[PDB]
Design a protein around this ligand. Structure first.
Ligand SMILES: Nc1nc2c(ncn2[C@@H]2O[C@H](COP(=O)(O)OP(=O)(O)OP(=O)(O)O)[C@@H](O)[C@H]2O)c(=O)[nH]1
Ligand SMILES: [Mg+2]
Ligand SMILES: [Mg+2]
Ligand SMILES: [Mg+2]
Ligand SMILES: [Mg+2]
Ligand SMILES: [Mg+2]
Ligand SMILES: [Mg+2]
Ligand SMILES: [Mg+2]
Ligand SMILES: [Mg+2]
Ligand SMILES: [Mg+2]
Ligand SMILES: [Mg+2]
Ligand SMILES: [Mg+2]
Ligand SMILES: [Mg+2]
Ligand SMILES: [Mg+2]
Ligand SMILES: [Mg+2]
Ligand SMILES: [Mg+2]
Ligand SMILES: [Mg+2]
Ligand SMILES: [Mg+2]
Ligand SMILES: [Mg+2]
Ligand SMILES: [Mg+2]
Ligand SMILES: [Mg+2]
Ligand SMILES: [Mg+2]
Ligand SMILES: [Mg+2]
Ligand SMILES: [Mg+2]
Ligand SMILES: [Mg+2]
Ligand SMILES: [Mg+2]
Ligand SMILES: [Mg+2]
Ligand SMILES: [Mg+2]
Ligand SMILES: [Mg+2]
Ligand SMILES: [Mg+2]
Ligand SMILES: [Mg+2]
Ligand SMILES: [Mg+2]
Ligand SMILES: [Mg+2]
Ligand SMILES: [Mg+2]
Ligand SMILES: [Mg+2]
Ligand SMILES: [Mg+2]
Ligand SMILES: [Mg+2]
Ligand SMILES: [Mg+2]
Ligand SMILES: [Mg+2]
Ligand SMILES: [Mg+2]
Ligand SMILES: [Mg+2]
Ligand SMILES: [Zn+2]
Lengths: 227, 19, 108
RNA sequence: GCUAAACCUAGCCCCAAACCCCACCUUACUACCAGACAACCUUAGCCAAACCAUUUACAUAAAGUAUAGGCGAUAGAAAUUGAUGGCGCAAUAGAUAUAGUACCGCAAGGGAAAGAUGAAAAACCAAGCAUAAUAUAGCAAGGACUAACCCCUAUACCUUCUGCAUAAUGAAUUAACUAGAAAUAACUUUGCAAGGAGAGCCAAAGCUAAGACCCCCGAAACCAGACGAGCUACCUAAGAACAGCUAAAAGAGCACACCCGUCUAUGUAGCAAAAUAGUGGGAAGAUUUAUAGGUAGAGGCGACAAACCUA
RNA sequence: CCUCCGCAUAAGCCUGCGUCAGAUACUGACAAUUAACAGCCCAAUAUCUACAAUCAACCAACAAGUCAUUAUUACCCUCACUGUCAACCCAACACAGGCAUGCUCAUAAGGAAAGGUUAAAAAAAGUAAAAGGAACUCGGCAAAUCUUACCCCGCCUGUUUACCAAAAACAUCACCUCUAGCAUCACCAGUAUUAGAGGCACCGCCUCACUUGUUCCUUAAAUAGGGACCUGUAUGGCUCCACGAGGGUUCAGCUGUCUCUUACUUUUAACCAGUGAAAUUGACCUGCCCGUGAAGAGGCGGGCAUAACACAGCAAGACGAGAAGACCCUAUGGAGCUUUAAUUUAUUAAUGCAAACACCUGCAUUAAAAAUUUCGGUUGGGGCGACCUCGGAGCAGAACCCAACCUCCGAGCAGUACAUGCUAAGACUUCACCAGUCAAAGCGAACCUCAAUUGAUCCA
């Protein structure tokens, strides 16, 4: 086939990027995943999951202003246009995140525990034990990859050594270097789980094709460590 | 099963011959 | 239903040369006393009818020229006058169609 | 007497010898802009083994020997030895070929037919019918007869079968074409003869040579490599259509265009290799549809009907 | 008189009813379609581009949506090329089919249902019908009317076997089970409220439903329909709100469905004129009755009948045409599918041991996935059941031999001895072969029972 991934843009931007649906087809043109196809056309909004990304020529903890919170077609959780200095960027909004709020992103691991405020980004080592976190990084600077869906919240259980224990929404436990950053609070759109599709047509709008008509006939896993 | 034999067309020149 | 056997040429001849299928001889043919061409007693002579038809066509072309357009049928009688003929007192008050030829002998 | 009949050479088959201006990879046959992407990779299967599973061939002589082998169907060495055209075809033949053209298929690919004067053109015979339709009754003829029929006798053929007129198969008919290849050992005829044969091989009358000796069409299939998503299944990109009325932000109701195809009738070599007329379902949606692209057969795609993938 | 249309663009085709001249919408020659419409574009490097559309204004949202530049540097000195026709394309055709878009919404544009005649049957379409009104019929199919009340299944809108099944089947919101802690080609530019693989089917209630008989309503009459009670079986069972070309029942109406058919019009039809197929076809000089027979005669036997021919109807026969029957059986013929059928793991995934200092390679083991191949025979057709080899007795009375899914019995050893050693004439023989039997004499020694009581080759 001649499939070329639409994910060719190299420069981050706020503009909605024109996507291209796959229909569950691999680059070879064959179906690799079933049930994907069609649906409303969508535009991707590049999300900056590295909440502590100091602006060029700038460094250290910095604050940003929330301009608006907007529905994201490509994500269960709604996003927020957060702007600081002379740049803007899309981020994952938290439950109680309103336009005009101030969001602090820091890399400082103080001797004490920072007073957690929903929506701000701090290194996991600086959070009080038991705070609800989201957008957690596996490695320092990797970027948020866990607890990114609507209403999902991880729990900071322990801070033994220079490591932090995180209970993921699936209740699995994760050891991450305390330097890795996470955002306080739970992801937005908490009532996503209580959404009733109502009609098969709405699933088709969302882009899920009907299931095949063919008829067919535990202990919590060990902690996952990254140290 | 359904048994269908496609029709066979004769070559055109035989019927297109002219004096 | 399809033929059970090929019908022989003998049977086919018996069928297709039967007196019914043969063309019957016509005994109503006669000679037209006017032109001498053959005609059937009950049918008009083809030659004489063609004469009349061609003369009628010429007269009708003249009528069309005189009328000059559709929906111009006259409300008065018509008289055909040939070269060397003058309208009669009876023909007075009737539209005259002038033919550029002598009066035919058969036409009176 | 019409359809027609014939015809001889266009060429071809097997051998020998000999080694063989411009345009065009983009939508080919398109004058004229920053490339980068470049190829090697065991054949398999049919078939034989009466299945099938290991297995099954791809000069002479030694020799069908040594060997291999569900030691079986079968496979099978080496050392060593020395190594100038036609009892062809002649237009249904011979090349498919007048031509890879016409035509058929999206494509790969399949693939024809045929012509005949003469030194000069600047000179009777197949079938089918017609001449000429037919006379009671009969496998159509035979015995006959003065006499065609009338009289008497007579259950087409081939194949298959225990047995066929069989109401079992095939055949309208004419022309042309269309189907028994061969070893061992025997038999007959010669030559020579304890030897025969023009190395090898055989031999307790053998040996050399010759003569004679074994068909055609037909599957559903299997495998390899190509070609196919202009139909259809689904998907991708960017588009388009959806009157009017009721209701009101509706996978809402009635109902056009449009899409579909419930039921009936017609049609069934049809207008049509799935249609027409009426009737009917949907008809702002999970809708319909134009365009280009993609998924290719140990596969694809599938709201699974074993659906559809060029009838 | 018709108007489905029509005119353009797209796509497709490629000169395919323009003129002239010839033949017997064909052939040859000649001419033609003129760009403004459309196609054919863009100098770089970075850098911008949150705020739909819907009369965009209120409102209303969810499915979250086609439309935007700047900074610097280069740069004008030049209007080519290509489509332009048509009655047209895809369907073998002047094919009643398919064919996107804009306007016209019945047309200003485009067209002709009847070759002529007659008005037979049968056939198709339509109109009308006395009285009756489903009595027709499997069924109110069709037609005429606009018409109630139910039951079964499916929640619903939708999807499906293109070309015999549109459905109760598939999907479906909802609910439930399982798997997965993660990024640069799907999933996904996503991250457990996510994604994938599934089951079932909205919601609601629970964790009673179906079978044995008796009965009630409905009809004059009911194997139909509906409702009760009565006996036993069997966290996925009850509940029909709405909806349905789904399957049954029904009031009323309606009507040619029918009692019971008739009349007319059109097509068809018949005759005249032109053009002109298809299956089929052994030859036919091609009758009826009875009998015969390869088990149902036009052809044979005995009777009867019998001048020759067309034309129009009919469908009782020609075991009529059509498809080398789809049913059934067979073939050591196929293929699809399923497996706890046989043989494998070549391929992946795991591990373990080597090799190297995780990856790769070699070797093993375990799974998934598959791959190749097979699916015996007899048989009162096949299946089921039974049987498959060997011996005794009847059938088969007397040399031998004789079938049976025929009648009855039995065997797959046991026991005793260790010359139950070796050899060797001649014979028998289960109708072939294989195999199986008896045995004189001799050497050497002493001084085999039993009917069956078993099995080749190869290979170990
Ligand atoms: N067997 C056979 N002999 C041939 C063939 N062609 C040619 N010859 C023979 O070749 C010889 C010479 O042929 P020619 O044509 O007379 O002479 P050429 O042209 O000198 O011959 P080439 O050198 O062979 O071309 C004659 O003996 C021919 O018969 C062929 O095809 N087969
Ligand atoms: Mg299912
Ligand atoms: Mg075999
Ligand atoms: Mg054989
Ligand atoms: Mg050698
Ligand atoms: Mg030839
Ligand atoms: Mg003749
Ligand atoms: Mg016969
Ligand atoms: Mg037969
Ligand atoms: Mg026949
Ligand atoms: Mg397509
Ligand atoms: Mg509308
Ligand atoms: Mg609707
Ligand atoms: Mg099924
Ligand atoms: Mg099935
Ligand atoms: Mg066709
Ligand atoms: Mg007409
Ligand atoms: Mg007529
Ligand atoms: Mg009436
Ligand atoms: Mg009744
Ligand atoms: Mg009633
Ligand atoms: Mg009745
Ligand atoms: Mg009806
Ligand atoms: Mg339904
Ligand atoms: Mg429906
Ligand atoms: Mg579908
Ligand atoms: Mg069907
Ligand atoms: Mg369909
Ligand atoms: Mg149907
Ligand atoms: Mg279902
Ligand atoms: Mg009834
Ligand atoms: Mg005629
Ligand atoms: Mg009889
Ligand atoms: Mg007749
Ligand atoms: Mg008839
Ligand atoms: Mg007969
Ligand atoms: Mg028949
Ligand atoms: Mg047969
Ligand atoms: Mg069968
Ligand atoms: Mg077999
Ligand atoms: Mg014997
Ligand atoms: Zn006359």
């Amino acid at each position: 086939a001649n499939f070329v991934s639409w994910k060719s843009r190299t420069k981050y931007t706020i503009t909605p990027v024109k996507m291209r649906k796959s229909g569950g087809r691999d680059h070879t043109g064959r179906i690799r995943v079933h049930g994907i196809g069609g649906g409303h056309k969508q535009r991707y909004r590049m999300i900056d999951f590295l909440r502590f990304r100091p602006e060029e020529t700038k460094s250290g903890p910095f604050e940003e202003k929330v301009i608006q919170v907007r529905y994201d077609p490509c994500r269960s959780a709604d996003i927020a246009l957060v702007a600081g200095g002379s740049r803007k960027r899309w981020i994952i909004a938290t439950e109680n995140m309103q336009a005009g709020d101030t969001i602090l992103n820091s890399n400082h691991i103080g001797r004490m525990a920072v007073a957690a405020r929903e929506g701000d980004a701090h290194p996991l080592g600086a959070l009080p034990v038991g705070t609800l976190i989201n957008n957690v990084e596996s490695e320092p600077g990797r970027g948020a990859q866990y607890i990114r869906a609507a209403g999902t919240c991880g729990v900071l259980l322990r801070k033994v050594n220079g490591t932090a224990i995180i209970q993921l929404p699936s209740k699995r436990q994760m050891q991450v270097l305390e330097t890795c950053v996470a955002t306080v609070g739970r992801v937005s759109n908490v009532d996503h789980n209580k959404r009733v599709i109502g009609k098969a047509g709405r699933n088709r709008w969302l882009g899920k094709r009907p299931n095949s008509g063919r008829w067919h006939r535990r202990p919590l896993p060990p902690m996952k460590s990254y140290v | 099963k359904k048994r269908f034999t496609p029709p066979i067309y004769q070559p055109k020149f035989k019927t297109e011959k002219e004096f | 239903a399809a033929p059970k056997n090929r019908r022989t040429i003998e049977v086919n001849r018996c069928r297709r040369r039967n007196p019914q299928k043969l063309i019957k001889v016509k005994n109503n043919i006669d000679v037209c006393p006017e032109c001498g061409h053959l005609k059937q007693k009950h049918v008009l002579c083809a030659y004489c009818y063609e004469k009349v038809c061609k003369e009628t066509a010429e007269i009708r072309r003249q009528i069309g020229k005189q009328e000059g357009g559709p929906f111009k049928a006259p409300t008065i009688e018509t008289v055909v006058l040939y070269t060397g003929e003058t309208p009669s007192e009876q023909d007075q008050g009737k539209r005259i169609i002038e033919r550029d030829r002598k009066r035919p002998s058969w036409f009176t």
